[PDB]
Nucleic acid binder design. Structure first.
Ligand SMILES: [Zn+2]
Lengths: 49, 201, 61, 225, 31, 115, 103, 81
RNA sequence: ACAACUGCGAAAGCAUUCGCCAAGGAUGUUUUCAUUAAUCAGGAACGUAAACUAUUAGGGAUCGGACGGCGUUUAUUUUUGACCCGUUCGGCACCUUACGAUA
C-alpha cells in the first residue's frame, strides 16, 4: 500500500514531457480488414525487404 | 407464394466489387463496429475491407461465394453504413426479406421553416409518431437530414413511401397513422377481404 | 394476475386457489386475490398450527 | 394455366430463330482484346437486308474485359458498328460512360466536386463532348473537417480544366484520343497542373459523347482493325 | 401471438398441480 | 461462353426478366412475372421471379449462350429507385439453374431534377 | 376525440422496445433478450401500459418506480442516463440525423 | 479581473488588440523606402498602398495593391520609416 | 448527389456552365465635406395554410478580409495557392453563465 502504479507513472511522465516480427504484424493485421496507414507503411517496408 | 428459401449451396466469372465513400465521423464508428460486418459478410462469402486512409468501404466477391444476390445485399449494406444507419440494422438488411429505400424529401417543400416544421412533424412528439409508424408498417425509419432512410419488407416500404409524401404535403402523420390503424383493423378479418375500403377512412 | 382479465383459466384457477386457501383457513375471505397478495403469510400458516388453534378454541390457556 | 385474352387474338406461333444468325464482334485498334462477343441479328434478304440494321446498332461494353485488367471495372465504353465482313462485325468508338455505382462511390460530404463540360472537335472533324469530374483533395496533416474551395477558386479550377482538355484534345486524332483516355493521362495532367490553385483528390473524365461523324472511310476504319 | 398465451396457460396449470399437491400434503389429506 | 445481357426490371407490381444480346436491340427471350402467376396480387413475388428465371434460363440454354451480364433496374423517374423482390429472386434462380453470371450493374434511371 | 389512437401513440415506445417490430434492430434484439422470451412477458407489458394509462388519466406518481435508493445508486443511474442521452444527441448532431426535441 | 491597472495595459496585450481598441487608437501601418537596383532613386511607399506605385520614371512597378499590405515587387530593398 | 448547427439578400427568397450589365458587404489605405445624424405621425417601393412548442464571458467550431511564419505540397527554384499556427476587425448560430430580469 503505497507502491508505484508503474503504468500510471509512465503515462504521467509521457504527458509531462510531451524483420521477423514485421511479418506476423501483417499476418495479424490482414484479418481485420482495416487498411490503417501504419499498415501501408508496413507494406512498403515489406516490399523493400 | 411469397416465402423465400435460403440458398443451399463458381457462379461468378468476373470478380465483382463495389465501393462507397464515408467521412471521418463515420470512420471512427465504422472502425470499431467493423468486425461484426466482416464476420457476417464472411458467413455470406464476400470479402469486406475498410480504408480509413481514403475513407472507403469495399466489398468484393471471393472464389467461394455461392449466393449471387449476396453482392447486392452487400452493396446495399455498405451504402447504409456510409449513410450512418447503425450497424445491427445495416446487418439486418442481409436477411432475405428485407430491403432499404431512400426518400428524397427536400424537393417537396419550397420554404425552409415550413420544411423544418414538417420534418419535425414527421418525427413527432418524443419520437412517438415515428415509432408508431415503425410499428404499424414493420419498418425502420431514420429521418436523415434531407432524406428519409427506411428498411423492411416491400409492403412496409410502399406504405412508408406514401406516408412520407403525404406528411410532406401537409397531411398530418397522426391522420395517416389513424388511416393505417383502420386498414390494419379491416385487414384483420377476411370477411371484408375485397371491397373498396374508402368508405371507412 | 399476469394473465389477461377475461381469461377462463384465470377465473377457474382464481376460484380454485381461493377455495383451497379458505378451506385450509389461511384466508378469511374467498372473494379477493389481494388476499393472496398481502394476506397469505407464514404467520397465517403458523396460526393454523395446532397449539395456537387450540389456544383459540380455549382447549388450553 | 387459364388464358385471359379476347376472341381471336392468339396467332399461330412462328419460330423466330430460324431467321437469326450470329456475328462475331471485333473491337477497334487501341483496345487489348479484339473478339468481344457475338450478336444475333436477323437473316438478310430483299426488303431490308440485315446489313442496314448492323450499320445501325451500337454496343455497350465494359473496359475490364477489353483491357483484361479489373482496374477498369468501371468506365463502360460504347462501340458503333458501321462495317460488316463475312461472319464479322467491325466497330468504332462512340462514347465512354461511367457506372452510376462509381458515380455514387465518388461523392463524399464536406468536400467539393467540380464539374466541367467541353465541346471539342478533333482533327478528323468529329465533334464530341468531354465531361470531367474532379473531387477536392483533403490534405494530410490537417484538422479542419471541411475541405471547401472558394467559389472563385472553383471557377479558376474549372477554367484550368477546360484549358487543359482543350489544349490536349484538340491536337490529336480520335485513335490517339482513345489511347490517351485509356490510362487517363488527361486526369493525371489536370491533377498535376491544378495543384497550384487547389489540390484535387481525383480528376476523371466521366463522359465522352461523339455527336457527329461526317465520314464513313473504310481506309481509316480498317486501319483501326 | 396466441402461442404465448397457450404457453402461459400451461405454465399456470403446471404451477397449480405442484401447489395443490403441496397444500393437500401439508393439510395432511383433509381437503 | 456467349454473354447475353439480361435486363431485370424489378418493380413492386411486376418483374420483367428480359434477355437481349450484347447490342440491346435483339430480344432473345423474355418472361414477365405475371404470366406465371394466376393472381395479380402475387404477380410481383419471389415465386414469380423464380419461375420466370427458370423459364428464361431454360430457353437460353436451349439456344446455348450459358453466360449472362445482368443489368437490374426499377421504376426510377419519380419512382422508388429500389428493385423489388423480383431482382434478388430472379438472380438467385437464374444462377441456380446453370448460367455463369458475368458483370452485375444496377442501371436505374436517376433524374438530375424531375419535379 | 379518438382513444385507441392516443393509446397506440403513447405505448409505441414500450411495444417497440418489447417485441413488436422484427425489422427494427432494438426490437429484434429484445424479442430474444430473455425478459421477453420468458413465460409472462405479455402480462408484464400489460401492467406497464396500464400504469401509463392511469398516468394519462391523471395519476401524478407511478406504481412501477422505486422510491427509496441509497443516493449513490440513484445518482449513478441518473448520471448514466443523462450521459447516454447526451452521447446520442452528439452522435446525432454529427451524421445529420434529426431527433425528437425535448427538454 | 476584479482589479487591474487600466491606464497601464501591457504592451503585448495592447499589441494584439485591434487598432480602434487600443487605449488611445492609432494605426499599425508604416512607410517604406524602395529602390530598384539599376536606379539610385528612392521612392517612399505606404505599406497598404492602393496605387500601383511607379518609381520617378522607367515604366516599372514597385508594388501591387491587395486586400491588406501592398505586395512589394521582385528584388527591391526596403528600410521602414 | 456536393448541400452544411454554412453563404448572400432588408423581406418573400436565391443552387447547371460561361458572357455582359449595374449594385451591395467586409477588410485595408500614406482618403476626403465636418454635423451632415438617431427614431418614427402622414405616405411610398417590393409579397391552400395551420396542427406539439453598457457588458454578460469566455471557450470550442465557422466563413469574409488584412497581417505575421517552424514547416510539408505546388516547386525544374521565385512567385502564388492548399494545410497547420498566432494576431486583428466583421458577421450568421451553439452551450455555459445571467449582469439580470419579469407577465
Ligand atoms: Zn527608378
Amino acid at each position: 500500500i503505497g507502491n508505484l502504479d508503474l503504468r500510471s507513472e509512465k503515462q504521467r511522465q509521457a504527458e509531462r514531457d510531451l524483420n521477423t516480427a514485421l511479418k506476423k504484424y501483417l499476418r495479424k493485421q490482414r484479418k481485420k480488414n482495416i487498411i490503417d496507414e501504419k499498415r501501408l507503411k508496413a507494406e512498403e517496408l515489406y516490399r523493400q525487404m | 407464394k411469397w416465402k423465400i428459401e435460403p440458398f443451399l449451396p463458381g457462379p461468378f466469372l468476373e470478380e465483382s466489387s463495389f465501393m462507397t465513400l464515408f467521412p471521418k465521423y463515420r470512420e471512427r464508428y465504422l472502425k470499431d463496429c467493423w468486425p461484426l460486418v466482416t464476420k457476417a459478410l464472411e458467413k455470406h462469402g464476400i470479402a469486406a475491407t475498410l480504408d480509413i486512409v481514403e475513407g472507403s468501404m469495399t466489398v468484393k466477391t471471393t472464389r467461394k461465394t455461392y449466393d449471387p444476390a449476396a453482392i447486392l445485399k452487400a452493396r446495399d449494406l455498405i451504402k447504409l453504413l456510409a449513410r450512418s444507419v447503425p450497424a445491427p440494422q445495416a446487418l439486418k438488411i442481409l436477411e432475405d426479406g428485407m430491403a432499404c429505400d431512400i426518400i428524397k424529401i427536400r424537393s417537396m417543400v419550397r420554404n425552409k421553416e415550413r420544411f423544418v416544421k414538417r420534418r419535425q412533424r414527421l418525427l413527432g412528439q418524443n419520437g412517438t409518431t415515428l415509432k408508431a409508424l415503425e410499428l404499424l408498417t414493420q419498418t425502420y425509419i431514420l429521418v436523415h437530414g434531407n432524406t428519409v432512410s427506411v428498411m423492411g419488407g416491400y409492403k412496409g416500404l410502399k406504405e412508408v413511401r406514401r406516408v412520407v409524401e403525404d406528411t410532406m404535403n401537409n397531411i398530418h402523420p397522426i391522420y395517416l397513422i389513424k388511416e393505417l390503424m383502420i386498414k390494419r383493423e379491416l385487414a384483420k378479418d377476411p370477411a371484408l377481404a375485397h371491397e373498396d375500403w374508402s368508405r371507412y377512412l | 394476475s399476469l394473465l389477461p382479465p377475461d381469461n377462463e383459466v384465470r377465473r377457474k384457477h382464481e376460484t380454485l386457489l381461493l377455495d383451497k386457501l379458505y378451506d385450509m383457513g389461511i384466508l378469511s375471505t374467498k372473494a379477493k386475490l389481494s388476499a393472496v397478495e398481502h394476506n397469505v403469510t407464514v404467520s397465517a400458516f403458523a396460526r393454523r398450527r395446532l397449539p395456537v388453534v387450540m389456544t383459540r378454541l380455549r382447549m388450553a390457556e | 394455366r387459364l388464358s385471359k385474352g379476347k376472341k381471336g387474338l392468339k396467332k399461330k406461333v412462328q419460330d423466330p430463330f430460324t431467321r437469326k444468325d450470329w456475328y462475331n464482334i471485333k473491337a477497334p485498334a487501341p483496345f487489348a482484346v479484339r473478339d468481344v462477343g457475338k450478336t444475333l441479328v436477323n437473316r438478310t434478304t430483299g426488303l431490308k437486308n440485315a446489313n442496314d440494321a448492323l450499320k445501325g446498332r451500337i454496343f455497350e461494353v465494359c473496359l475490364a474485359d477489353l483491357q483484361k485488367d479489373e482496374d477498369h471495372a468501371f468506365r463502360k465504353i460504347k462501340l458503333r458498328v458501321d462495317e460488316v465482313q463475312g461472319k464479322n462485325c467491325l466497330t468504332n468508338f462512340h462514347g465512354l460512360d461511367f457506372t452510376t455505382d462509381k458515380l455514387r462511390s465518388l461523392v463524399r460530404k464536406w468536400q467539393t466536386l467540380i464539374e466541367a463540360n467541353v465541346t471539342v472537335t478533333t482533327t478528323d472533324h468529329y465533334l464530341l463532348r468531354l465531361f470531367a469530374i474532379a473531387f477536392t483533395k483533403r490534405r494530410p496533416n490537417q484538422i479542419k473537417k471541411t475541405t471547401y474551395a472558394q467559389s472563385s477558386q472553383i471557377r479558376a479550377i474549372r477554367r484550368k480544366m477546360v484549358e487543359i482538355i482543350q489544349r490536349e484534345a484538340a491536337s490529336c486524332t480520335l485513335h490517339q484520343l482513345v489511347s490517351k483516355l485509356i490510362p487517363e493521362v488527361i486526369g493525371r495532367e489536370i491533377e498535376k497542373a491544378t495543384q497550384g490553385i487547389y489540390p484535387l483528390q481525383n480528376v476523371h473524365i466521366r463522359k465522352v459523347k461523339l455527336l457527329k461523324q461526317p465520314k464513313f472511310d473504310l481506309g481509316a476504319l480498317m486501319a483501326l482493325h | 401471438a396466441d402461442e404465448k398465451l397457450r404457453r402461459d396457460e400451461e405454465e399456470i396449470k403446471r404451477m397449480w398441480k405442484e401447489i395443490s399437491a403441496k397444500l393437500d400434503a401439508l393439510s395432511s389429506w383433509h381437503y | 461462353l456467349v454473354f447475353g445481357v439480361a435486363r431485370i426490371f424489378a418493380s413492386f407490381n411486376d418483374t420483367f426478366v428480359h434477355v437481349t444480346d450484347l447490342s440491346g436491340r435483339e430480344t432473345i427471350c423474355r418472361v414477365t412475372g405475371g404470366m406465371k402467376v394466376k393472381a395479380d396480387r402475387d404477380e410481383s413475388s419471389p415465386y414469380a421471379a423464380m419461375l420466370a428465371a427458370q423459364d428464361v434460363a431454360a430457353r437460353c440454354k436451349e439456344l446455348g449462350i450459358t453466360a449472362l451480364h445482368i443489368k437490374i433496374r426499377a421504376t426510377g423517374g419519380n419512382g422508388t429507385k429500389t428493385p423489388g423482390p423480383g431482382a434478388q429472386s430472379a438472380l438467385r434462380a437464374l444462377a441456380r439453374s446453370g448460367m455463369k453470371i458475368g458483370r452485375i450493374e444496377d442501371v436505374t434511371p436517376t433524374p438530375s431534377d424531375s419535379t | 376525440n379518438d382513444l385507441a389512437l392516443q393509446r397506440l401513440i403513447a405505448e409505441s415506445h414500450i411495444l417497440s422496445e418489447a417485441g413488436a417490430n422484427p425489422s427494427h434492430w432494438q426490437s429484434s434484439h429484445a424479442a430474444t433478450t430473455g425478459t421477453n422470451t420468458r413465460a409472462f412477458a405479455t402480462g408484464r407489458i400489460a401492467k406497464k401500459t396500464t400504469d401509463m394509462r392511469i398516468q394519462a388519466l391523471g395519476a401524478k406518481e407511478s406504481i412501477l418506480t422505486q422510491q427509496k435508493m441509497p443516493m449513490n445508486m440513484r445518482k449513478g443511474i441518473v448520471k448514466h442516463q443523462e450521459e447516454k442521452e447526451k452521447k446520442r444527441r452528439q452522435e446525432a448532431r454529427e451524421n445529420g440525423i434529426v431527433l425528437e426535441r425535448e427538454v | 479581473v476584479l482589479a487591474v491597472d487600466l491606464l497601464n495595459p501591457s504592451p503585448a496585450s495592447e499589441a494584439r488588440k485591434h487598432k480602434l481598441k487600443t487605449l488611445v487608437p492609432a494605426p499599425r501601418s508604416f512607410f517604406m523606402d524602395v529602390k530598384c537596383p539599376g536606379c539610385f532613386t528612392i521612392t517612399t511607399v505606404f505599406s497598404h498602398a492602393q496605387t500601383v506605385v511607379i518609381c520617378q520614371g522607367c515604366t516599372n512597378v514597385l508594388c501591387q495593391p491587395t486586400g491588406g499590405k501592398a505586395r512589394l515587387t521582385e528584388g527591391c530593398s526596403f528600410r521602414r520609416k
